[PDB]
Design an enzyme around this catalytic site. Sequence first.
Site, mmCIF file in Angstrom:
data_model
loop_
_atom_site.group_PDB
_atom_site.id
_atom_site.type_symbol
_atom_site.label_atom_id
_atom_site.label_comp_id
_atom_site.label_asym_id
_atom_site.label_seq_id
_atom_site.Cartn_x
_atom_site.Cartn_y
_atom_site.Cartn_z
ATOM 1 N N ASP A 35 0.800 -1.224 0.000
ATOM 2 C CA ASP A 35 0.000 0.000 0.000
ATOM 3 C C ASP A 35 0.835 1.278 0.000
ATOM 4 O OD1 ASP A 35 -2.080 1.841 0.214
ATOM 5 O OD2 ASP A 35 -2.188 1.663 2.398
ATOM 6 N N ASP A 221 -1.869 5.604 -5.191
ATOM 7 C CA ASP A 221 -2.243 4.706 -4.105
ATOM 8 C C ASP A 221 -2.557 3.302 -4.615
ATOM 9 O OD1 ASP A 221 -3.179 3.515 -1.775
ATOM 10 O OD2 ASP A 221 -5.002 4.730 -1.666
HETATM 11 C C1 LIG Z 1 -6.015 10.518 1.363
HETATM 12 C C2 LIG Z 1 -6.377 9.198 0.703
HETATM 13 C C3 LIG Z 1 -5.687 8.007 1.374
HETATM 14 C C4 LIG Z 1 -6.047 6.659 0.754
HETATM 15 C C5 LIG Z 1 -5.386 5.417 1.416
HETATM 16 N N1 LIG Z 1 -5.837 4.153 0.794
HETATM 17 C C6 LIG Z 1 -5.044 2.911 1.059
HETATM 18 C C7 LIG Z 1 -6.002 1.813 1.655
HETATM 19 C C8 LIG Z 1 -5.292 0.524 2.121
HETATM 20 C C9 LIG Z 1 -6.241 -0.648 2.234
HETATM 21 C C10 LIG Z 1 -7.029 -0.812 3.378
HETATM 22 C C11 LIG Z 1 -7.910 -1.886 3.465
HETATM 23 C C12 LIG Z 1 -8.033 -2.801 2.420
HETATM 24 C C13 LIG Z 1 -7.271 -2.649 1.263
HETATM 25 C C14 LIG Z 1 -6.380 -1.566 1.180
HETATM 26 C C15 LIG Z 1 -7.393 -3.633 0.119
HETATM 27 C C16 LIG Z 1 -8.236 -3.160 -1.088
HETATM 28 C C17 LIG Z 1 -9.657 -2.678 -0.704
HETATM 29 C C18 LIG Z 1 -10.390 -1.834 -1.759
HETATM 30 C C19 LIG Z 1 -10.389 -0.346 -1.499
HETATM 31 C C20 LIG Z 1 -9.405 0.186 -0.665
HETATM 32 C C21 LIG Z 1 -9.347 1.555 -0.401
HETATM 33 C C22 LIG Z 1 -10.314 2.386 -0.982
HETATM 34 C C23 LIG Z 1 -11.320 1.878 -1.829
HETATM 35 N N2 LIG Z 1 -12.310 2.751 -2.431
HETATM 36 C C24 LIG Z 1 -13.056 3.766 -1.620
HETATM 37 C C25 LIG Z 1 -13.800 3.222 -0.362
HETATM 38 C C26 LIG Z 1 -14.472 1.858 -0.543
HETATM 39 S S1 LIG Z 1 -12.622 2.647 -4.062
HETATM 40 C C27 LIG Z 1 -13.936 1.604 -4.277
HETATM 41 O O1 LIG Z 1 -11.519 2.004 -4.677
HETATM 42 O O2 LIG Z 1 -13.033 3.937 -4.470
HETATM 43 C C28 LIG Z 1 -11.341 0.497 -2.080
HETATM 44 C C29 LIG Z 1 -8.280 2.094 0.525
HETATM 45 O O3 LIG Z 1 -8.480 3.146 1.126
HETATM 46 N N3 LIG Z 1 -7.085 1.418 0.735
HETATM 47 C C30 LIG Z 1 -5.610 5.425 2.944
HETATM 48 O O4 LIG Z 1 -6.714 5.186 3.434
HETATM 49 N N4 LIG Z 1 -4.512 5.712 3.738
HETATM 50 C C31 LIG Z 1 -4.604 5.749 5.203
HETATM 51 C C32 LIG Z 1 -4.132 7.099 5.772
HETATM 52 C C33 LIG Z 1 -4.437 7.253 7.264
HETATM 53 C C34 LIG Z 1 -2.643 7.326 5.524
#
Ligand SMILES: CCCC[C@H](NC[C@@H]1Cc2cccc(c2)CCCCc2cc(cc(N(CCC)S(C)(=O)=O)c2)C(=O)N1)C(=O)NCC(C)C
Length: 370
Positions: A35, A221
């Site tokens: 990630d 990301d």
């Molecule tokens: C400022 C933005 C930061 C984004 C960043 N995203 C990374 C995370 C990591 C992560 C966490 C859990 C599961 C996965 C991976 C596996 C795949 C699941 C599908 C998914 C994931 C995300 C996000 C989605 N989507 C939106 C919500 C469902 S989507 C459908 O793709 O639009 C799907 C998402 O936010 N994964 C974040 O949260 N960082 C934390 C922060 C405190 C530093």
Amino acid sequence: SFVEMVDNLRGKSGQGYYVEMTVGSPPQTLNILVDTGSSNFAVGAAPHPFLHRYYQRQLSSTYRDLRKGVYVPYTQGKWEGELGTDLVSIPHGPNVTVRANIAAITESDKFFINGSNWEGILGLAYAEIARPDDSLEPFFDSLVKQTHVPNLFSLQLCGAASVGGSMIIGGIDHSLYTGSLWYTPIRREWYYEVIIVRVEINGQDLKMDCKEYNYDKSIVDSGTTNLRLPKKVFEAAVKSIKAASSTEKFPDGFWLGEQLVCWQAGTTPWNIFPVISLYLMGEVTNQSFRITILPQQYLRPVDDCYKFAISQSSTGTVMGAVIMEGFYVVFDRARKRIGFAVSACHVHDEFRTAAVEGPFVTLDMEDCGY
Ligand SMILES: CCCC[C@H](NC[C@@H]1Cc2cccc(c2)CCCCc2cc(cc(N(CCC)S(C)(=O)=O)c2)C(=O)N1)C(=O)NCC(C)C
């Protein structure tokens, strides 16, 4: 040199990519999510319905307790746990062992996924966004400090249930891409933030103020599935994509990613869906480059059935897996830049292809930063 690291990534569609790691002495094998959207290294350390296995601190002679709690909220899911340190290795990575910060996950909400086959997460971004604060050194910083591994890694994420790819740690593998690498500056070392300077749909400029494209920010990301856009940009894009595909009509909730669209197998009308070009800030003055993504990327497969993988964001532009798939992405931390090139597993159809092209001239690029 890097051949040992090719194809070291596995996963299920829409559920992230993971690499095999070991933690503790003796080594405990776990599948760890890759990630670039976070900076915390954490693993399941307690029983959970969706976990095949988990980290048992009790069985590690090298485990140390930091005696501090921690929680990390993600766009999807969140967990809390106990901070500590232990020895970590990557079997299909560099031949090294480092002592790294590890969060032992004890409680979670919608974080672990049933059948995903991963038990932890590897945050590859910078200390500024680490929880609880930036004093908790991220894994890759520890790796670089404790070893001779170059301050760089590259991700080759490949599409189609099962997906695969490569995480090249400490370098660039030239057999994994074709053409030239094009670099965009890392604006600030926190997320992997970049600047989008222009957007085109089927060759037509969206003609928005370029600040809207990075409204708040734009990040790369690998943990996010979709291309997430700020509301105004999302609406502009959807309006254009609706227009290009207007020959067909689709439930309104398809465009919000709530319900699927289905077509008879082999009949999918790819040609009615437009290509999307994102122009990124280049390395020299007034110079950009563009990455072009095909509908096969933002129409994620789920008769052949798909989900619209472009969605809204209230935290800026998030360039997720749909963007990264088909490209070789270099995270050149040493030179504060991110490289894009056409991947060896690139997506294309009979008449259109994913592309990385430059150089382009773009005026007043600095105005696009929020
Ligand atoms: C400022 C933005 C930061 C984004 C960043 N995203 C990374 C995370 C990591 C992560 C966490 C859990 C599961 C996965 C991976 C596996 C795949 C699941 C599908 C998914 C994931 C995300 C996000 C989605 N989507 C939106 C919500 C469902 S989507 C459908 O793709 O639009 C799907 C998402 O936010 N994964 C974040 O949260 N960082 C934390 C922060 C405190 C530093």
